């Protein structure tokens, strides 16, 4: 009687949704056709006899990815008319997907959301995935969040956004729409998790020893993180954690809800079994700055609160004995007004392996969600990138001619300045 609905918008969102939906189907024993040859209820729904239907909706204005989905092996799984598709792409223009073509599509998505919600009885909250540096992704994510915040109100929404890397970039105009989308979801999303690609590339290179990774390898790690986060809702555990038990433990103030994640262990089968993978060493590896899932240095800032999930055969006393060691270290310092900052969850189900993938099978794993003061650097560098081109009003004509006003750029800049001032104000000791 506990449910959650995941929203996938944009090319990156759909490509990570595919990645998480192989993993969930594999973890619950459901074949790609949707047929089994009481834990499924969190992500799926029973049709009365036979197949299961995911509680997910796919959105995009550009039809190529959806058409690829509707012809692959998973054509029989998803309901045919929840893969909403458009005709014309926003083409990396934020104003297009927020004012011009997204408005005519958003009504169908909201109707689908209502039709899925009326089925659930214990709706925990929503999940949303969107790559920020694109037109349709950021614009439609903003519009959907704004509609949901007023249609439903206090229901919790979680956002797994992928911000651009510090120096590596695929587009040339992504700072503009990244800043605008951050403006939009700052006052509209309860949790936002950092996911830039460069850090995960470094993780793959160093640990998985892959020298030529593709997007699928990144999306599989993200899917594993999602599964670790939501395992506690569908498996028995000695110390459970619910989604609603987050803003009471990781969010000191309503404005501050951007945090960065990490995962451990990450290791290949060729050298995994030569070492014992004790809980102490994995919880040490999880706190290593080089294993952050976002390219930010935690040594440059304080910690505010750490929520970290275990799964497997871990014993609570071993967890406490390792939290003490971390509190001992002099290179990790917490904020003054937080004496204890750890929330611990323990689950019994070990992580599942996907055949043909990178990760091996292990009995212990740890996933941490940590809120730290050091996150302000990404905001500062994105702001610096934005200012350089906004000084000469470059690329603005592509946005003014799509219905957006001239002054809309300035207030996003002011909100980022306010956020950066707030992060500095919080981190000073009393």
């Amino acid at each position: 009687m506990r449910e959650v609905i995941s929203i996938h918008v944009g090319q990156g969102g759909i490509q990570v949704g595919n990645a998480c939906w192989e993993l969930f189907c594999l973890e619950h024993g459901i074949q790609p056709d949707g047929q089994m040859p009481d834990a499924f209820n969190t992500f799926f729904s029973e049709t009365g006899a036979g197949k299961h239907v995911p509680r997910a909706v796919f959105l995009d204005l550009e039809p190529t990815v959806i058409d690829e989905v509707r012809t692959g092996t998973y054509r029989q799984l998803f309901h045919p008319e929840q893969l909403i598709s458009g005709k014309e792409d926003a083409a990396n223009n934020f104003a297009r997907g927020h004012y011009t073509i997204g408005k005519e599509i958003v009504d169908l998505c909201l109707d689908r959301i209502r039709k899925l919600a009326d089925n659930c009885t214990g709706l925990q909250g929503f999940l949303v995935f969107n790559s920020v540096g694109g037109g349709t992704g950021s614009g439609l994510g903003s519009l959907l969040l704004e509609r949901l915040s007023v249609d439903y109100g206090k229901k919790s929404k979680l956002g797994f956004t992928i911000y651009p890397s510090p120096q590596v970039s695929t587009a040339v105009v992504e700072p503009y729409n990244s800043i605008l989308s951050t403006h939009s979801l700052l006052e509209h999303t309860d949790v936002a998790v950092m996911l830039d690609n460069e850090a995960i590339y470094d993780i793959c290179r160093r640990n998985l020893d892959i020298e030529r990774p593709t997007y699928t390898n990144l999306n599989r790690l993200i899917a594993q993180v999602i599964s670790s986060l939501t395992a506690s809702l569908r498996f028995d555990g000695a110390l459970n954690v619910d989604i609603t038990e987050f803003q009471t433990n990781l969010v000191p103030y309503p404005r501050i809800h951007f945090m960065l994640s990490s995962y451990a262990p990450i290791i290949s089968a060729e050298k995994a079994y030569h070492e014992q993978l004790s809980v102490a060493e994995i919880t040490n590896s999880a706190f290593e700055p080089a294993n952050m899932m976002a390219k930010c240095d935690p040594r440059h800032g304080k910690y505010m609160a750490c929520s970290m999930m275990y799964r497997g055969d871990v014993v609570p006393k071993d967890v406490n004995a390792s939290i003490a060691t971390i509190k001992t270290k002099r290179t990790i310092q917490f904020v003054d007004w937080c004496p204890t900052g750890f929330k611990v969850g323990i689950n019994y189900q070990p992580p599942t392996v996907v055949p043909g993938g990178d990760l091996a099978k292990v009995m212990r794993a740890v996933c941490m969600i940590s809120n730290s003061t050091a996150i302000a650097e990404v905001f500062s560098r994105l702001d610096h990138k934005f200012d350089l081109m906004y000084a000469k009003r470059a690329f603005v004509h592509w946005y003014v001619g799509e219905g957006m006003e001239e002054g809309e750029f300035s207030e996003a800049r002011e909100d980022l300045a306010a956020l950066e001032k707030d992060y500095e104000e919080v981190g000073i000791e009393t």
Binding site: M1, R2, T121, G122, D236, A238, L239, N240, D242, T244, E245, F246, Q247, T248, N249, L250, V251, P252, Y253, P254, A305, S307, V315, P316, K317, D318, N320, I323, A324, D336, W337, C338, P339, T340, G341, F342, K343, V344, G345, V426, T430
Partner: protein
Amino acid sequence: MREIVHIQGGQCGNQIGAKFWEVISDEHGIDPTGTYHGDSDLQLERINVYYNEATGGRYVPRAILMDLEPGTMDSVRAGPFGQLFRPDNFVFGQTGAGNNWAKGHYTEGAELIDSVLDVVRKEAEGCDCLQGFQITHSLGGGTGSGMGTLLISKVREEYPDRIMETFSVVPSPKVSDTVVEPYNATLSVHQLVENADECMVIDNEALYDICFRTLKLTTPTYGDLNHLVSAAMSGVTCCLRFPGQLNSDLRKLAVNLIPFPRLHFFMIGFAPLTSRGSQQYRALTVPELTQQMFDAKNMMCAADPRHGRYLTASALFRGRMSTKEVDEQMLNVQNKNSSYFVEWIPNNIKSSICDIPPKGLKMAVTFVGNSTAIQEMFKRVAEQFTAMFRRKAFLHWYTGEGMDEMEFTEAESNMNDLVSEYQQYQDATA
């Protein structure tokens, strides 16, 4: 006659009860199907204390299970001895509290509590002669620490002359699993002192310390901590269910261990406890039991009892033994430690003997002592509370559901006043 009903709330309380009832059933020879298969006549004479009688000759506990989420009770039913509980007594909500005290005490816990109070009233009105209630809950969680404490006040308002027990687990700063523990601990201690006739604090840190040092087992789990807590719980009411040289119900302990109505926070301990490999070396004698009973590491709390002076003490011996030896040993443990006993109340140790030992053991002792050393726990809890509250961290979650900071200030002031007036008698001299 003089029976009590069981009420438990939250996940921690449900897990404690899931072992407490197993221990009681094994003691009385009740199979997991509710059928008596015991050996001794005394096993059935006073079974009305905890068990009711139904048609078909089976027995059903008079326990009431409540939580704001259905998962824990849906899991405890599948465990051993899970079928004994009457399905009608299961009451649950569909939302949960998310470790937020305000949600579990003002908004959600207020509407649901009518249904559980209905079954509580049904159970109490029916029974032959009420002795009282015993409550198991945790102070580290939202729904538990809120709904349980509000239920305490509601029960006290309707049965002012009955006795009330509470076994409360307080969050230690060593093993912290939730970041918002100080808030709902401090808020709960405020209400708990006003209504509970007896309170018994239990700490996970002390349980891990005991398991690692005395039993010396490699991998402690929640099952061992629950088993120790269950043995301690059963030891208190043993003489009320079995004959003995000096019977002593709960009210007699209440008279003899509480000097002033606001000083009713005890810490307990169980003896004997020996490792598997050393269970053959030791010989069970009254001196061996009493030397381990007053041992500082044997207390179920991290509070150090030689950092203060005992106001009073109690011991509940089990098994057949001579009373002269018990009295002389109690005198000896009080003459050799005169510095740690307050001097203006002479003969401050109570003893009782029950002729029925635990199954598998020939002698056992349960210790309940009211000491001034408990101040250290409230001191550190208030220290963390005032470290976190001065910045108003995580305050918006509580203030968004009708609560204000004034109730936080009053709670802090009352808790500090309790801390001060509890140590006031430590320096008092005759």
